[PDB]
Amino acid sequence: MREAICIHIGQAGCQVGNACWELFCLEHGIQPDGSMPSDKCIGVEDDAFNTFFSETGAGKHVPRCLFLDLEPTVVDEVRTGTYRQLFNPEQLVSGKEDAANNYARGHYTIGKEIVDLALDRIRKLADNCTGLQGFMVFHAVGGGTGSGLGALLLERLSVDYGKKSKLGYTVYPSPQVSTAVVEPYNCVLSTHSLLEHTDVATMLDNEAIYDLTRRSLDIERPSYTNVNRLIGQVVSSLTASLRFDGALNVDLTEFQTNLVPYPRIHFVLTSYAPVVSAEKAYHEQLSVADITNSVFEPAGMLTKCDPRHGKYMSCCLMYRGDVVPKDVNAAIATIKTKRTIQFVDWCPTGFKCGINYQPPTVVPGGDLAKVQRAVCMIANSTAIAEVFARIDHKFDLMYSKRAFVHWYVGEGMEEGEFSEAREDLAALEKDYEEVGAES
Amino acid sequence: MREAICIHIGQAGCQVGNACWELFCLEHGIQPDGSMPDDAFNTFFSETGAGKHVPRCLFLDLEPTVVDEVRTGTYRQLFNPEQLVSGKEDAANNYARGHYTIGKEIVDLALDRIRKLADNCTGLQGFMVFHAVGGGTGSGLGALLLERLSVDYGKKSKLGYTVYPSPQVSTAVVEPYNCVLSTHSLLEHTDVATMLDNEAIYDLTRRSLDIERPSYTNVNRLIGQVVSSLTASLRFDGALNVDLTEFQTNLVPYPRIHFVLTSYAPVVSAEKAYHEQLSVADITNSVFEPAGMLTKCDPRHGKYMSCCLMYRGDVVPKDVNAAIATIKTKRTIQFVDWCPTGFKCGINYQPPTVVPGGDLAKVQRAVCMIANSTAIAEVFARIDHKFDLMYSKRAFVHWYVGEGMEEGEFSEAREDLAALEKDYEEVGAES
Amino acid sequence: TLDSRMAFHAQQQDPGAPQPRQLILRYFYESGTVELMEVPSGRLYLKRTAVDIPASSFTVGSTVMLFGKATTITAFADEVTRQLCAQCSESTTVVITEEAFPSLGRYLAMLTEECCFTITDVEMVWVQRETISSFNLPEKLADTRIVVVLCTRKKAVEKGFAFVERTT
Amino acid sequence: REIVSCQAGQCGNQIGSKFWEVISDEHGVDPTGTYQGDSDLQLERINVYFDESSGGRYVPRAVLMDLEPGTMDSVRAGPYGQLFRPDNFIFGQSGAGNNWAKGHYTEGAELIDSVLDVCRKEAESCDCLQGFQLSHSLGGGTGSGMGTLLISKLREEYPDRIMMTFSVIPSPRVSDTVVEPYNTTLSVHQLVENSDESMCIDNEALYDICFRTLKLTTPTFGDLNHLVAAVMSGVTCCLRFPGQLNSDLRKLAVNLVPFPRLHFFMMGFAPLTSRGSQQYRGLSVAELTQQMFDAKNMMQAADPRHGRYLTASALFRGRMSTKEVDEQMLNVQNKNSSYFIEWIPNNIKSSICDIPPKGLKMSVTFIGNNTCIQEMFRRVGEQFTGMFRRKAFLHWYTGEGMDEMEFTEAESNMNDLVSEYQQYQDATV
Amino acid sequence: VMAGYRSVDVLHPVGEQLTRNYDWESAGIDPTQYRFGKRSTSSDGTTATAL
Amino acid sequence: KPFLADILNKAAERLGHKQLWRVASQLERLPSPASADVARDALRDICVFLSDEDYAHMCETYRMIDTAALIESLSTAPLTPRRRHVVNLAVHKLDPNATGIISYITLSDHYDVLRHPEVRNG
Ligand SMILES: Nc1nc2c(ncn2[C@@H]2O[C@H](COP(=O)(O)OP(=O)(O)OP(=O)(O)O)[C@@H](O)[C@H]2O)c(=O)[nH]1
Ligand SMILES: Nc1nc2c(ncn2[C@@H]2O[C@H](COP(=O)(O)OP(=O)(O)OP(=O)(O)O)[C@@H](O)[C@H]2O)c(=O)[nH]1
Ligand SMILES: Nc1nc2c(ncn2[C@@H]2O[C@H](COP(=O)(O)OP(=O)(O)O)[C@@H](O)[C@H]2O)c(=O)[nH]1
Ligand SMILES: [Mg+2]
Ligand SMILES: [Mg+2]
Ligand SMILES: [Mg+2]
Structure with missing residues (x-):
């Protein structure tokens, strides 16, 4: 019951899924071999792990995941590393030749020969789950297989599974620092698929995570490992409501309608705190109000999208640990009193809160410190128009005189697809601006 | 409850805060680790769930030497790694740099940490800003942070302990420029401003305490003792309790008149403490003597507009009143005609404490002096002369000009400083 | 939910039911929390709830009360639990003969407080000339009246040796 | 006289669990089901909430409803969870997701049939039931959407039984649901024409009582629900126990519902003192009456002195005197005649029960049909209109089967109700 | 030359906490x-005890 | 002094606060010095018990036990200096000769009742 299927696409999706599944195994007490530790081999088991791991008669759990990448390097790294026993040889579908940052190549030429197998794996995973809540897709729109193959997979999932919930925890290109040069093309081309064929989209850009790790976790040289550890902590904090008993448990559809006001408006900003090392954690008064304020601070979130430059639409808080409902209420009241952050006029309440009794867990050999209480905040706000403006100004300045367009048109993509994507992103800006405008 | 947020700016501010906190830790019995081996510390320290406490203070300086000295010294355990901000390059005795160019890149995060401390606080009584206007960062950021605090918290109580330049001794040649520039900020956006000049406390330590070679450690230790004496009324119970607003409404007769003289007695050494019989009348007389005053402002040269005496120890209202009558009778000091009572006293049962590395001998009874006097016009009449004699033909001005400050700001600051005494002698003139 | 816990097989025997409930309970010894499930299905029988019952009395072969339910521990459930229970609550028996009956309460008080034992059970036994050989008690106790204490503690055998050396 | 109870949603299930363990304690019923009460008066009317099996042990006459099975598992795992009958745990697979449409139109319809089957068998088991209780929160999806469907179907099947609906209407500053005004507006119109009496509860007022009336720093939901549990146990105690002047649900309805649409009441409970103030205050009707009408003791966050009491009812428990139970209420009438409506003389129904709640020498439960409750309806309607102008959070309802016309009709019914309250608050004789 | 490059090390290891040598043993x-x-406050007494 | 605190409390609940003189009587009947075994036996016949850790701590701080030192610590340590000199003054008045013997006649002569609040109540 309450199962959710994790589909990981691209290198970024594969690595963040590796971190997520390591952390899930740590929370549910699952050894890297895929089985419970021998010393605590109780015959009867609870239903908590059922949401993420499928049980086998031998007593060895199997994650409800589908790793998928055209490039075989990362999937072979998973199949060779410490989680080879945990991971099925199937549901780890591999390609042979890469997309190479090309949305056209990953969606029109090389994606068709593997999308069918990917959907076969999805059906095999879904028939095992009797209470499937939905799908969580981890990928980065910057790359080719993340954008193209991810777009195709989300389209096929939407056309096959009907109105099943879909959460793309995707990594958009960060505003000032970027790794790929055709990354603006990939983002602007995949925003069409993430708009119509994805029910909720979460921004997980890299430089905000870097700044958070540098300024709060006190790491001078953070890496993708630390970034993915934070992303996995956020995923666990959001999904633990149905995994563990809490004062106010929420499911996927519980916050789906509370966070999506309009069908076209579902992009949401993410934030998590307290994220502090052991060297500093006990120096501050880690209370519910303090952690809520830290989350609402522009420097305490996972995205480079200032809320003070925008306007919040709907806030959802996921408290974990020794949190008290009226401590949450006091935090909400002080947020109402605070004037730096302001909500839209037509949404008076604008708050969702879910209290869970499970505090976050820290990976062995990690750098974060376990805390009495934590909270993850996911918010729909009008400020995402600014990151959209950054990316679309990037795209127009790149597209002024036909840069890199020959690569895309040589892979079965029409030239007008870029124009259609640009108009779609312009409309995605315009509707945000209109709904943020005062009544 | 009764929280009081401390802020320290510049080298002088950080040293004064170091002395203050090493005093408060022993006053509460808190080890440098942060835990004791009664919510009295709630005013200054925030208790954690580990059984230890964190001070409610923000250290701030645009140069890193002092803050890394704090970060490496004995109080690493006590001090929060944040609220201990460091800069990248100091103003270097340049109000223009500390207020316009290089202070604006740190004031935002400074206010972020200050408002984090405020949210942690529940019944915040006010802010206590320790700095020296004679410096560059202590003037520039002392203006920027204070004006931002004023615009954010409205009319919230602020007490600025300012080490004003001494009339004869000064460690900088642009010190008068900085002082005249920053008096505008210390006037408009500071509820009370406390004189803490250097050479007066120097002479006090040399004469009463009898040390051949005192130092900044001793002067900041005495300043911190005065600070704790003033703030102990909201920290321990007493026969007469005085709060920040409680003595603000008694020491601020006019909005422009909030610059206050201080002194403390008995300031006695170990050898001389045992023999002397310290009484309330004796300590009050020693306070009102200019020798015990720690600011270069002669009480005899002006009229005391208001008196407020923090009595600490086994002091008693009967002896307080007897000393009050004796001060009224003797003619050494004179009060303003339209202020008949002119006295306020706060009696606290907690005797003052003495810290390691110091020279003060602990006295079962002590008293601090916070006064509004018309004689405060004389220190400003020294400073304006000091500034004009250098600004007459445009010296040490290109540094400020090239850092984004208009040349007319000097004239505006000078006119405001002149208005200071044009109000002081005005309100001191007999009716 | 990851906290270290002691897992024990337990029985309830609800009135009218022909069979015991056949539960398992985990006590989180760092706290006072207990939780229960049933062996066949695995549904949560009892949430994580704090109880006033001391941790020392949750040893094997002991019965307690959980919200009016007589819950009896039958055997351990995990070998980590067996190891930690052997380390902490080690059981032993002390038999006091008939010449120390006037100091029966004296000896019991020294078991409870002097020797830090916790008395899981205390009874009296009339020794038989056959039971003496059947259960290998000292021959001097034959056809007499003795008191037997099942008591648990760390290093229970050594503590019992110390007791019998310090008393008669 | 039998009352069969229903719990809907997580809030309703938790409140019902608390109420069931409180009433089991009052009747001396252990989780085993066997009665061990120290007085035969408990067995004398144990039937009202309990029906026994072949083993001689009683089970609650309760029906549990939720699309999610998680709260069902928690309730069953509670200390008194095993007391409930296993077949009465009717649960689905996919949750409502705080969607009144999902809980009332598609996912609720496929399960309301089984709920109606179990309710029918439970009602036919008893001689002749006095009626139905429901415990739910109008702000949620399954508690409200399915709750109103249950109300409608049970009203259709049993027209002449008394329908009490303990509705936890939630407040914005204590709120935790963005579609809260939508759900509340869609539930209130059903409750208006479908409930014999609605029992209003606010989390803000419960928190206020827990904060300053009880001086408890942080009492959780397990302590908030105990107060409404005591409210239910004291409002139904007239049936289960004898008294000098006994009443029932029909008596309270006829004495507190002057007009068919005027059947919403705010709740308060007395006495309520801290542990440190237990030995400071004398327990007497004089002290009970003063806090009966006090705002901080009232557990519905709608301010009482901005309205006129149409009617009120005082259900006293404990051996006391009939003088001071009504003479003091007359004193309240006289010295607060401004706060009490004019054309209805002696707005107070008074009832006496000989058995006080366990642990209390004397107690009283206050039920008031004041017109000040229009503040809650008006402001939640303002929130509803504020979101409804821009059609926000509405594609879910439209795709799930709701209609804009039905939303407008719900708004119109809410406005009609609030105007009905206002025109009696302001008008004179 | 590349063989000599062996002795060259990395100036800063990746993912290193900037520890300033706290005295955890004394801190306990x-x-x-x-x-x-912060262990969340436990309100002494409950509604059941109050009633 | 955990063993002193434990023994003082244990005696207080088991015998009553008003009759702590039983421990003094037992320790006086004990010889000076006294062996640890007989110290345990006689001290504990009045049903005051110490854990093995507390007993080991007592033996380490004090086979022979300095019973006089134990009596002094029992009557001296649990008192703040105010109580210390108050009881010293009372004992000095009761026994002006410092002979360590208090007689019934002298105690009755030096014991006051009339100022007791309850006898004022009558
Ligand atoms: N958070 C996170 N982001 C990553 C990670 N790896 C890469 N990224 C970013 O995500 C963007 C997308 O890159 P990929 O995930 O490799 O997508 P791709 O280029 O199509 O992958 P391939 O075509 O198989 O090489 C890159 O530009 C990186 O900046 C990661 O491990 N974690
Ligand atoms: N009370 C006190 N005053 C000091 C101390 N050290 C220096 N001062 C005086 O305070 C004045 C201000 O100078 P600084 O303490 O360096 O402050 P600052 O100049 O603003 O700091 P920077 O601009 O970074 O150099 C100096 O002219 C000194 O005379 C001290 O430790 N205690
Ligand atoms: N008194 C009380 N109120 C609760 C409890 N649980 C939830 N609530 C309230 O119910 C509201 C949410 O309703 P919900 O349970 O989601 O309704 P559902 O979705 O239909 O099951 C919140 O605003 C809470 O204030 C509880 O245990 N006790
Ligand atoms: Mg790749
Ligand atoms: Mg400096
Ligand atoms: Mg009748």
């Missing part, structure tokens, strides 16, 4: 095995 807290934070 193990940073790895201590759940840092």
Whole structure:
């Protein structure tokens, strides 16, 4: 019951899924071999792990995941590393030749020969789950297989599974620092698929995570490992409501309608705190109000999208640990009193809160410190128009005189697809601006 | 409850805060680790769930030497790694740099940490800003942070302990420029401003305490003792309790008149403490003597507009009143005609404490002096002369000009400083 | 939910039911929390709830009360639990003969407080000339009246040796 | 006289669990089901909430409803969870997701049939039931959407039984649901024409009582629900126990519902003192009456002195005197005649029960049909209109089967109700 | 030359906590095995006890 | 002094606060010095008990036990200096000769009742 299927696409999706599944195994007490530790081999088991791991008669759990990448390097790294026993040889579908940052190549030429197998794996995973809540897709729109193959997979999932919930925890290109040069093309081309064929989209850009790790976790040289550890902590904090008993448990559809006001408006900003090392954690008064304020601070979130430059639409808080409902209420009241952050006029309440009794867990050999209480905040706000403006100004300045367009048109993509994507992103800006405008 | 947020700016501010906190830790019995081996510390320290406490203070300086000295010294355990901000390059005795160019890149995060401390606080009584206007960062950021605090918290109580330049001794040649520039900020956006000049406390330590070679450690230790004496009324119970607003409404007769003289007695050494019989009348007389005053402002040269005496120890209202009558009778000091009572006293049962590395001998009874006097016009009449004699033909001005400050700001600051005494002698003139 | 816990097989025997409930309970010894499930299905029988019952009395072969339910521990459930229970609550028996009956309460008080034992059970036994050989008690106790204490503690055998050396 | 109870949603299930363990304690019923009460008066009317099996042990006459099975598992795992009958745990697979449409139109319809089957068998088991209780929160999806469907179907099947609906209407500053005004507006119109009496509860007022009336720093939901549990146990105690002047649900309805649409009441409970103030205050009707009408003791966050009491009812428990139970209420009438409506003389129904709640020498439960409750309806309607102008959070309802016309009709019914309250608050004789 | 490059090391290891040598033994807290934070207040007494 | 605190409390609940003189009587009947075994036996016949850790701590701080030192610590340590000199003054008045013997006649002569609040109540 309450199962959710994790589909990981691209290198970024594969690595963040590796971190997520390591952390899930740590929370549910699952050894890297895929089985419970021998010393605590109780015959009867609870239903908590059922949401993420499928049980086998031998007593060895199997994650409800589908790793998928055209490039075989990362999937072979998973199949060779410490989680080879945990991971099925199937549901780890591999390609042979890469997309190479090309949305056209990953969606029109090389994606068709593997999308069918990917959907076969999805059906095999879904028939095992009797209470499937939905799908969580981890990928980065910057790359080719993340954008193209991810777009195709989300389209096929939407056309096959009907109105099943879909959460793309995707990594958009960060505003000032970027790794790929055709990354603006990939983002602007995949925003069409993430708009119509994805029910909720979460921004997980890299430089905000870097700044958070540098300024709060006190790491001078953070890496993708630390970034993915934070992303996995956020995923666990959001999904633990149905995994563990809490004062106010929420499911996927519980916050789906509370966070999506309009069908076209579902992009949401993410934030998590307290994220502090052991060297500093006990120096501050880690209370519910303090952690809520830290989350609402522009420097305490996972995205480079200032809320003070925008306007919040709907806030959802996921408290974990020794949190008290009226401590949450006091935090909400002080947020109402605070004037730096302001909500839209037509949404008076604008708050969702879910209290869970499970505090976050820290990976062995990690750098974060376990805390009495934590909270993850996911918010729909009008400020995402600014990151959209950054990316679309990037795209127009790149597209002024036909840069890199020959690569895309040589892979079965029409030239007008870029124009259609640009108009779609312009409309995605315009509707945000209109709904943020005062009544 | 009764929280009081401390802020320290510049080298002088950080040293004064170091002395203050090493005093408060022993006053509460808190080890440098942060835990004791009664919510009295709630005013200054925030208790954690580990059984230890964190001070409610923000250290701030645009140069890193002092803050890394704090970060490496004995109080690493006590001090929060944040609220201990460091800069990248100091103003270097340049109000223009500390207020316009290089202070604006740190004031935002400074206010972020200050408002984090405020949210942690529940019944915040006010802010206590320790700095020296004679410096560059202590003037520039002392203006920027204070004006931002004023615009954010409205009319919230602020007490600025300012080490004003001494009339004869000064460690900088642009010190008068900085002082005249920053008096505008210390006037408009500071509820009370406390004189803490250097050479007066120097002479006090040399004469009463009898040390051949005192130092900044001793002067900041005495300043911190005065600070704790003033703030102990909201920290321990007493026969007469005085709060920040409680003595603000008694020491601020006019909005422009909030610059206050201080002194403390008995300031006695170990050898001389045992023999002397310290009484309330004796300590009050020693306070009102200019020798015990720690600011270069002669009480005899002006009229005391208001008196407020923090009595600490086994002091008693009967002896307080007897000393009050004796001060009224003797003619050494004179009060303003339209202020008949002119006295306020706060009696606290907690005797003052003495810290390691110091020279003060602990006295079962002590008293601090916070006064509004018309004689405060004389220190400003020294400073304006000091500034004009250098600004007459445009010296040490290109540094400020090239850092984004208009040349007319000097004239505006000078006119405001002149208005200071044009109000002081005005309100001191007999009716 | 990851906290270290002691897992024990337990029985309830609800009135009218022909069979015991056949539960398992985990006590989180760092706290006072207990939780229960049933062996066949695995549904949560009892949430994580704090109880006033001391941790020392949750040893094997002991019965307690959980919200009016007589819950009896039958055997351990995990070998980590067996190891930690052997380390902490080690059981032993002390038999006091008939010449120390006037100091029966004296000896019991020294078991409870002097020797830090916790008395899981205390009874009296009339020794038989056959039971003496059947259960290998000292021959001097034959056809007499003795008191037997099942008591648990760390290093229970050594503590019992110390007791019998310090008393008669 | 039998009352069969229903719990809907997580809030309703938790409140019902608390109420069931409180009433089991009052009747001396252990989780085993066997009665061990120290007085035969408990067995004398144990039937009202309990029906026994072949083993001689009683089970609650309760029906549990939720699309999610998680709260069902928690309730069953509670200390008194095993007391409930296993077949009465009717649960689905996919949750409502705080969607009144999902809980009332598609996912609720496929399960309301089984709920109606179990309710029918439970009602036919008893001689002749006095009626139905429901415990739910109008702000949620399954508690409200399915709750109103249950109300409608049970009203259709049993027209002449008394329908009490303990509705936890939630407040914005204590709120935790963005579609809260939508759900509340869609539930209130059903409750208006479908409930014999609605029992209003606010989390803000419960928190206020827990904060300053009880001086408890942080009492959780397990302590908030105990107060409404005591409210239910004291409002139904007239049936289960004898008294000098006994009443029932029909008596309270006829004495507190002057007009068919005027059947919403705010709740308060007395006495309520801290542990440190237990030995400071004398327990007497004089002290009970003063806090009966006090705002901080009232557990519905709608301010009482901005309205006129149409009617009120005082259900006293404990051996006391009939003088001071009504003479003091007359004193309240006289010295607060401004706060009490004019054309209805002696707005107070008074009832006496000989058995006080366990642990209390004397107690009283206050039920008031004041017109000040229009503040809650008006402001939640303002929130509803504020979101409804821009059609926000509405594609879910439209795709799930709701209609804009039905939303407008719900708004119109809410406005009609609030105007009905206002025109009696302001008008004179 | 590339063989000589062996002795060259990395100036800064990746993912290194900037520890300033806290005195955890005196503090009585193990940073790895201590759940840092505030134990939420436990309101002494409950509604059941109040009634 | 955990063993002193434990023994003082244990005696307080088991015998009553008003009759702590039983421990003094037992320790006086004990010889000076006294062996640890007989000290345990006689001290504990009045049903005051110490854990093995507390007993080991007592033996380490004090086979022979300095019973006089134990009596002095029992009557001296649990008192703040105010109580210390108050009881010293009372004992000095009761026994002006410092002979360590208090007689019934002298105690009755030096014991006051009339100022007791309850006898004022009558
Ligand atoms: N958070 C996170 N982001 C990553 C990670 N790896 C890469 N990224 C970013 O995500 C963007 C997308 O890159 P990929 O995930 O490799 O997508 P791709 O280029 O199509 O992958 P391939 O075509 O198989 O090489 C890159 O530009 C990186 O900046 C990661 O491990 N974690
Ligand atoms: N009370 C006190 N005053 C000091 C101390 N050290 C220096 N001062 C005086 O305070 C004045 C201000 O100078 P600084 O303490 O360096 O402050 P600052 O100049 O603003 O700091 P920077 O601009 O970074 O150099 C100096 O002219 C000194 O005379 C001290 O430790 N205690
Ligand atoms: N008194 C009380 N109120 C609760 C409890 N649980 C939830 N609530 C309230 O119910 C509201 C949410 O309703 P919900 O349970 O989601 O309704 P559902 O979705 O239909 O099951 C919140 O605003 C809470 O204030 C509880 O245990 N006790
Ligand atoms: Mg790749
Ligand atoms: Mg400096
Ligand atoms: Mg009748």
